[PDB]
């Protein structure tokens, strides 16, 4: 019964996505419509600035990508993926792209602004989240991954740094630099070292299952306060990931441990989210027995934590960064490479 309604939701959600996917929105604003206030982050590539749209007085987070820097880092195809996917999608725990445009020098992606900061800041500061607090957030990622994978999208960069906390204490996934629409396998080495599935490390050719492995890393990090595999250098992290051993805090409930052994499973035929019953092997698990999935989607569950509102354009929940000027050259750079943007 439950599953047939999920099916119906997802079929309607796919029709919506396809229209925007085959016909992307393009050139929907211009830089001179925004007042630049402050740099509030750096992503996989580029920088993100608090801005204010003059015509509405809305505040937004604008990501700026230097087209020449993107070509040198061989991210052309990934940045086109990123804007094409983000303009097409629509789900409550995905940050919304409000405008996109480009000029002679840069690409711009203007997104809704979450003044509360990201899970990284809050997690590091308090040390670790309780299990109920961790499950509240995990549940949102489980549904989001359910939404994305049904559209044939792999996300490929789950980590606390990419999860914004809204004014209701719910998540928005906020960086799509590696998101990709693929049916079947793909091979690019990308993601963040602590979060990489063993099949990525081993140049093996992978699918959506790497997102579920990354979920296991996230849950563990939220509940332990540190990642399951850590070291001072990436190569030392990769050895630990491929070894196939993992150790849990003594405070993890036996159900948490058993969820996590099934997500951090090196064996792809045994890894939860991958099997015949897909996402329901996760959703029906015991660690999740208290979770009401519809109440999470609707935002009826009480959030464990609500960031302090110090205004629509307050930036105290982000760190300070170096301010680079936006330089727009008088000549067009990389026109052909980015024509579809």
């Amino acid at each position: 019964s439950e599953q047939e309604s999920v099916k119906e939701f997802l079929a309607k959600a796919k029709e919506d996505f396809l229209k925007k996917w085959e016909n992307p929105a393009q050139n929907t604003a211009h830089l001179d419509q925004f007042e630049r206030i402050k740099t509030i982050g750096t992503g996989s590539f580029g920088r993100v600035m608090l801005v204010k749209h003059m015509e509405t007085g809305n505040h937004y987070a604008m990501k700026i990508l230097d087209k020449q820097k993107v070509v040198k880092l061989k991210q052309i195809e990934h940045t086109l993926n990123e804007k094409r996917i983000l303009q097409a999608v629509n789900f409550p725990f995905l940050v919304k792209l409000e405008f996109s445009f480009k000029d002679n020098s840069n690409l711009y992606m203007v997104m809704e602004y979450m003044p509360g900061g990201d899970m990284f800041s809050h997690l590091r500061r308090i040390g670790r989240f309780s299990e109920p607090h961790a499950r509240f957030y995990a549940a949102q990622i489980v549904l989001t991954f359910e939404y994305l994978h049904s559209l044939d999208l792999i996300y490929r960069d789950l980590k606390p740094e990419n999860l914004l906390i809204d004014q209701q204490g719910y998540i928005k996934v906020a960086d799509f630099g590696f998101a990709k629409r693929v049916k079947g396998r793909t091979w690019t080495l990308c993601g963040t070292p602590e979060y990489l599935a063993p099949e990525i490390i081993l140049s093996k050719g992978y699918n959506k299952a790497v997102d579920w492995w990354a979920l296991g890393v996230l849950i563990y990090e939220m509940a332990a306060g540190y990642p399951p595999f850590f070291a001072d250098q990436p190569i030392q992290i990769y050895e630990k990931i491929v070894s196939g051993k993992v150790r849990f805090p003594s405070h993890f409930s036996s159900d948490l441990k058993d969820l996590l052994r099934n997500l951090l499973q090196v064996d792809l035929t045994k890894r939860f989210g991958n099997l015949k019953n897909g996402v329901n092997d996760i959703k029906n698990h015991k660690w999740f027995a208290t979770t009401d999935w519809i109440a999470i989607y609707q935002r009826k569950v009480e959030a464990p934590f609500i960031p302090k509102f110090k205004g629509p354009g307050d930036t105290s929940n982000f760190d300070d960064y170096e301010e680079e000027e936006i330089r727009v050259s008088i000549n067009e750079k990389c026109g052909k490479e980015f024509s579809e943007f």
């Binding site: 750096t42 996989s44 880092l73 061989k74 991210q75 990284f120 590091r124 040390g127 960069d157 980590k159 740094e161 630099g177 590696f178 690019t188 080495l189 990308c190 993601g191 963040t192 070292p193 602590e194 332990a224 306060g225 540190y226 990642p227 850590f230 070291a231 001072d232 990436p234 805090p249």
Partner: peptide, 20 residues
């Protein structure tokens, strides 16, 4: 403790994505 080893490690700040 494991928490103490992590907190003394060089990877407690924001982690960059990797690539080819």
């Amino acid at each position: 403790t494991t928490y103490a080893d992590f907190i003394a490690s060089g990877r407690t700040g924001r982690r960059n994505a990797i690539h080819d």
